[PDB]
Amino acid sequence: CLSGDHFYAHMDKIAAAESIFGERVVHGYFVLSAAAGLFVDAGVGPVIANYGLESLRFIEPVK
Amino acid sequence: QQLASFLSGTWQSGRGRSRLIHHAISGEALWEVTSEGLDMAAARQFAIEKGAPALRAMTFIERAAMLKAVAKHLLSEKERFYALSAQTGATRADSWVDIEGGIGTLFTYASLGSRELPDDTLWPEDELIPLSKEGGFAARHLLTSKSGVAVHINAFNFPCWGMLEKLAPTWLGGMPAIIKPATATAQLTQAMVKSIVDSGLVPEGAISLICGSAGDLLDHLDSQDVVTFTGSAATGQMLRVQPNIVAKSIPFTMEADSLNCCVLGEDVTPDQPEFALFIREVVREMTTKAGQKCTAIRRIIVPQALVNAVSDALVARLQKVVVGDPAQEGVKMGALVNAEQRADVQEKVNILLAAGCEIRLGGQADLSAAGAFFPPTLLYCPQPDETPAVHATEAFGPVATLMPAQNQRHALQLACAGGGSLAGTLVTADPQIARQFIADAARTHGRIQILNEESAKESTGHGSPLPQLVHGGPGRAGGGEELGGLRAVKHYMQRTAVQGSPTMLAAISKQWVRGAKVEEDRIHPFRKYFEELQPGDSLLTPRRTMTEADIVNFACLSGDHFYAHMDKIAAAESIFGERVVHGYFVLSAAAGLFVDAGVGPVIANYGLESLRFIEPVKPGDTIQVRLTCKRKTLKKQRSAEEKPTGVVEWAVEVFNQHQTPVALYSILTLVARQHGDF
Amino acid sequence: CLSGDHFYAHMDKIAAAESIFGERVVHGYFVLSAAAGLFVDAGVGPVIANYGLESLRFIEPVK
Amino acid sequence: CLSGDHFYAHMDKIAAAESIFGERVVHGYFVLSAAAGLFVDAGVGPVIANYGLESLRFIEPVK
């Protein structure tokens, strides 16, 4: 809803059943976003800006 | 028995002064090699005008599939390769390296050509080099395959591997090869070449063979040719001063003989497991392939307090090594390839004994035996700094001298005193000692294995050069480099920096780059199949106004309450001036804009190549995304049940109402093909 | 986000300024949904089901 | 939550089990809103304004 990515492997029970994943899976960018929600310190510190991401490969699906 | 030479598409043999191949373990002559009277100019001519346009007409994906097909066809009939390699005096475990390492090199170059090489005749290795402020003038480096032949002059060590580790970068690079094996073991090389040719997989002219001297090959080479050498230094340094090679300026790559080291550190005490794996590594590397490999350990550097322990444990481990016939059981080491090589090893031992010492069976070697047997030899040098013959002379067999060191400062100097080596080893459990060893000893070694207890379990060892690691070394080791992953296929290409407008570079490279012309054709690009996509098929998505509620909902949902997004005070004290939109929410809302919701050829995403956030995105700051196709690169559909597909790359360009490029990046995406091939 | 209706008169600041509304407005279906949030009792009562809406007209935009 | 319609046939497990639907069902106005999220173009086009709805009948429940 928030991102607007209504892809059929995430938002469709029928089409994801006939896909390679078998059922509808978590978005890869939400795995990225919740990862950054896990490791980023909320407080003010030496970390200034992010601006970068080197090599992203989604290996196995998250359900 | 006639041992022919595949030249000009036909199997031919010379007529002249013929050398002859002796059987290694017994001694009789059962092959003869000659190439006199064979027209080498017609061979190079047939190769250049028959197999070079056939290889260059293929794409890199098709050439990688050709390498995989040749690997499967040569792995199927692999037992005749062992039958022909048993004549070289090697055992089953010694010929296993020679056959299966070359076939795995073919599979590895097939995998590297399938994963990181384009579906094009050409290969752009750069992304883009901007050379203008407006953007209408840019450049990038191409890599076009050369229009000549590759002359591979191999050593007698690995016929199968040493031909076949050079043949995969040559074919994958895009050139036809002319292989000149060493005339001591060319029968296995002709078995390999015949198994390649009698399969219908490679084009005609793409591979040649000369069992014998080249004679007039080097005098006819064009400037688009390369020569790769492996063997003695005295031959390759005379083939470097050949007048056509220096006149036409063709790349001569040489791999000479090296003095490989195995340095023992001060931290290793004999109660540790490091000592036993050190001794096992030295013994296995000295006895594998009878010490006739180019990466064999020939200088053991130990501390002064550990001279007696190493020099007794090596004897207690190497007296178990049985040197005999490979077919009879209980025989570890095989034999050398020839009696001439046995005489060469014995005269190099007699040179090393002019200033060294003796620990074991050394110069005692029966020259009258029916077989090229040489015992495992462990030498000793009490004054390594005052003996240049240790650091200038290699005995190319089971010979490896031992010499002490003084507290990791003399050990680095003795490891670097080899004049530039091909391989090296430090056995420690201290990472700072390994850091100090690489800080000085990597200048002379092209490969260094740091062996400890964790590494020694699943290691490939020290005498199996990996097909994706650089098999080279400076100075005495030759100077050239081989097997460096995709570095080896760049020795067979020309690197041309192509300049122009980006809309011209996109049609040259067959890849949309940064500022080329677009092709918007009223339907969504994710609805297109693979064959109807083109690099440059763009999409101008609708807009989305970023607000404070977007920042709040993404910081809540992701759980990323970073102070430049969720604090009004600290963001005013920061570089941004106020709190900004998350970069990952710019990424997520971008993907919300360009990804079509319906079921189409897009299978999965699984990829994101290079994300950079340039300018910050604020509340009240709109976002518009320019999705455009960049790179197609189909996959070969390895089975028949699998769906045909291709890894299509999309360059994503987000921008605001000021049209400045915030968050430009690139995604990979699997797109199913309409029509398959296999 | 929730409905998935990213219409340009609701989610675009630029195109809503170039349109008849002048600025981006509230969705009419959200006016309907928040209306039903206001007048519907949460408790169990005589109301069985809804199933019906007779004649909906949006006259003036909600900002 | 967003609309505020906490009707017992959508938000209660006990009362919707004893109702005519058998369990708690999806809101009809959310079926309407997700429908409009499915068929409406996000971009600027010939469609200017919506302002209307002719005859809404919810026939079978959505679960």
| Residues forming a β-bridge with B671 | B602, B646
The 3-class SS string of chain C reads CCCCCCCHHHHCHHHHHCCCCCCCCCCHHHHHHHHHHHHCCCCCCCCCCCCEECCEECCCCCC
Q: Tell me whether residue B64 is in a domain.
A: yes
B60-76 and B160-173 are packed helices; what angle lies between their axes, rounded to 10 degrees? 160
Structure tokens, B386: 């005052």
Q: What are phi and psi of B665, to 5 degrees?
A: -155, -170
CA distance B221 to B242: 11
- Does A34 contact B614 at a Cβ distance shorter than 8 Å? no
Q: What residues of chain D lie within 8 A of the CB of B542, using their CB?
A: 42-44
Q: Residue B340 catalytic?
A: no
Q: Tell me whether residue B465 is in a domain.
A: yes
| CB burial readout B284-303, b (16+ within 10 A) else e | bbbbbbbbbbbbbbbbbbbb
Contact D38, C9 (CB under 8 A): no
DSSP string spanning B444-473? TBS-EEE--TTTTSS---SSS--TBS----
Question: What was the experiment behind these coordinates?
Answer: cryo-EM
CA distance B24 to B285: 21
Instruction: Write the CA distances from A22 to A28, A29, B596, B607, integer angstroms.
Output: 16, 19, 20, 20
B60 & B179 share domain: yes
Instruction: Write the CA distances from B557 to A3, A40, B117, B450, D46, integer angstroms.
Output: 11, 14, 39, 46, 35
Structure tokens, B644: 């045909």
Q: Are strands B260-264 and B297-303 parallel, antiparallel or unpaired?
A: parallel
C3, C37, C54: residue with CB nearest D37: C3
Chain D residues 13-32 with CB within 8 Å of chain C: 15, 19-21, 28-30, 32
CATH number at residue B213: 3.40.605.10
B401 & B329 share domain: yes
The 3-class SS string of B173-194 reads HCCCEEEECCCCCHHHHHHHHH
Tell me how crowded residue B483 is: count the other CB atoms within 10 A of its CB. Answer: 22
B343 & B363 share domain: yes
Strands (E) located in B223-373? 226-230, 252-255, 260-264, 297-303, 357-358
Structure-derived torsion over alpha carbons of residues B121, B125, B130, B131, reported in degrees to the nearest 10: -80
Out of B464, B493, B522, a domain closes at: B493
CA distance B581 to B622: 11
Contact B275, B309 (CB under 8 A): yes
Structure tokens, B492: 């067979």
B569 & B470 share domain: no
| Å between B595 CA and nearest CA of chain D | 13
Contacts of A53 (CB under 8 A, 6+ apart): B608, B610, B611, B665
**D45 in B contact zone (CB under 8 Å):** no
**DSSP state, B146?**
P
B211, B294, B416, B629: the catalytic one is: B294
B290: left (phi over 0), alpha (psi -120 to 50) or beta: left
CA distance B300 to B285: 12
Breaks in chain A after (C-N > 2.5 angstroms): none
CA distance B288 to B290: 5
CA distance B67 to B207: 13
CA distance B23 to B31: 9
Q: Report resolution (Å) to 1 decimal.
A: 2.9
Range of the domain at B542: 495-672
Q: Tell me whether residue B677 is in a domain.
A: no
- Taking alpha carbons only, the member of B636, B631, B666 closest to residue B648 is B631
B609: left (phi over 0), alpha (psi -120 to 50) or beta: alpha
Q: Residue B261 catalytic?
A: no
B221 & B233 share domain: yes
Question: Exposed (0-12), middle (13-18) or buried (19+): which is B646, by Cβ within 10 Å?
Answer: buried
CA distance D60 to B554: 35
B217 & B75 share domain: yes
Q: Tell me which chain A residue has its CA closest to the CA of residue C2.
A: A1
CATH number at residue B436: 3.40.309.10
| CB burial readout B589-606, b (16+ within 10 A) else e | bbbbbbbbbebbbbbbbb
